């Protein structure tokens, strides 16, 4: 066949690229970073009315100051989260302090290219790249609120806002306009909620969508349905208002 870590003539790694195609088929995930915190929202996307929508966990807590959202082959994200959580706790044990959001992200991305069948560089024993992308959002005393996009390519970017998954290119353009350096947390919440509504196939409600944020004061919290449902209502109203 052809090496799992081969280069296309255009200078790209097939497996990583094909990996990205998979992520495109994933459920939408959006993150907005403001000076009042970072907001993370995701499209549950239950595949059947019998599936208990709240057993869908696409937003998880890395540490009290770091949380993340995933898109694509979500099963692949478990070991990533695990690695992340451990790295956070471990850092704290060794240094008596919180792991910087960028450092944590850098650590997760270090697993990215560790795949192959005998790649001369260490012991990269993983048959394929990860089929999921992550939005790592947190806060630290050095660079405040941060939003990161971690991909199977090993590279991670920092965004003020970012959308990944099925409705990404669409939602991304939206964020472009809507985002400004003085958004409030509440504005960002509604905003994410609105953009999810446009890209989602299903009619957004507090059951096929989930919000969450991370603020220096109370850290990472996942909004329980009731809390979100009202923001949904509040959004429909502000929209109908013009």
């Amino acid at each position: 066949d052809r090496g799992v870590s081969t280069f296309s003539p255009e200078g790209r790694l097939f497996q990583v690229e094909y990996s990205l195609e998979a992520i495109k088929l994933g459920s939408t995930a959006i993150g907005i970073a403001t000076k009042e915190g970072v907001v993370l929202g995701v499209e549950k996307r239950a595949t059947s009315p019998l599936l208990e929508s709240d057993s869908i966990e696409k937003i998880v807590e890395i540490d009290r100051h770091i949380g993340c959202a995933m898109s694509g082959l979500t099963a692949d994200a478990r070991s990533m989260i695990e690695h992340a959580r451990t790295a956070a706790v471990t850092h704290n044990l060794y240094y008596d302090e919180d792991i910087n959001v960028e450092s944590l992200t850098q650590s997760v991305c270090d697993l990215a290219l560790r795949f192959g069948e005998g790649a001369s560089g260490e012991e990269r024993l993983m048959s394929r790249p990860f089929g999921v992308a992550l939005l790592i959002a947190g806060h630290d005393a050095d660079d405040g609120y941060q939003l990161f996009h971690a991909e199977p390519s090993g590279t991670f970017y920092r965004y003020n806002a970012k959308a990944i998954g099925s409705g990404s290119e669409g939602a991304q353009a939206e964020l472009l306009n809507e985002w400004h350096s003085s958004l409030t947390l509440k504005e960002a919440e509604l905003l994410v909620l609105k953009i999810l509504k446009q890209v989602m196939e299903e009619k957004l409600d507090e059951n096929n969508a989930q919000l969450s944020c991370i603020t220096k004061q109370d850290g990472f919290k996942i909004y329980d349905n009731e809390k979100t449902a009202e923001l949904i209502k509040e959004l429909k109203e502000k929209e109908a208002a013009e």
Binding site: T6, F7, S8, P9, E10, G121, G154, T155, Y157, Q172
Partner: protein, 233 residues
């Protein structure tokens, strides 16, 4: 042709080419531009940080390896991390064991040798990143260009990345000029920014988009970004 000899690095084409290595090189080109130039007292790295969206950052392209050495990356970020890190250890080792700062020329040999290994054994893939190493050691200022092929060269100045050909011609001209910017850092830097702009086209180097690093006689390799470079735009 090619299609049958580019399945992996361990294969030679009928003409003697290693396509996988070549495709790796192709990732460098697709990478943002960066430039390096040195006088006899300093060495400077001016790198153009590239952004995904206007909501995304301009991914850092300058890594410090030791107080007296650093480099700029053009290509796969992860690979630059791997390589920079390796260099950081070699520098560290040299200090701890011999209480000696690592010669820039030697750091180059180490990088070449490490890359070469991924081009002769099955399974591995070449590194998809280009590196520009600058440093001040026991023999003055130094500038190195590192190619994934394993080829490392020492120059007075140079550039790699997209449209890098602009800056490279400009410096091949400005040679006699900047090579004498001894004792003056701000000039060598300006001389660099004037080389990097020779490869622009899309936009103009903004503040949160320009990145410069310097090292020399009495300057521990340091990196400037944003406000720090404002006075160079």
């Amino acid at each position: 042709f090619r299609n049958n000899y580019d399945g992996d690095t361990v294969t030679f084409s009928p003409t003697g080419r290693l396509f996988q290595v070549e495709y790796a090189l192709e990732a460098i080109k697709q990478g943002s531009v960066t430039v390096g130039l040195r006088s006899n007292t300093h060495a400077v790295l001016v790198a153009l940080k590239r952004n995904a969206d206007e909501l995304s950052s301009y991914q850092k392209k300058i890594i410090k390896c030791d107080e007296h050495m650093g480099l700029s990356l053009a290509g796969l970020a992860p690979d630059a991390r791997v390589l920079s890190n390796y260099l950081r250890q070699q520098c560290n080792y040299s200090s701890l064991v011999f209480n000696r700062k690592l010669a820039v020329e030697r750091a180059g040999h180490l990088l070449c040798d490490k890359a070469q290994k991924n081009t002769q054994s099955y399974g591995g893939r070449p590194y998809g990143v280009g590196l520009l190493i600058i440093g001040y050691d026991k023999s003055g200022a130094h500038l190195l260009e590192f190619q994934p092929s394993g080829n490392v060269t020492e120059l007075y100045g140079t550039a790699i990345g997209a449209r890098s050909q602009g800056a490279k011609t400009y410096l091949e001209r400005t040679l006699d000029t900047f090579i004498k910017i001894d004792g003056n850092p701000d000039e060598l830097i300006k001389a660099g920014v004037e080389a990097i702009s020779q490869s622009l086209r899309d936009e103009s180097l903004t503040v949160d988009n320009l990145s410069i690093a310097i090292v020399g006689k009495d300057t521990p390799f340091t990196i400037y970004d944003g406000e720090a470079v404002a006075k160079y735009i």
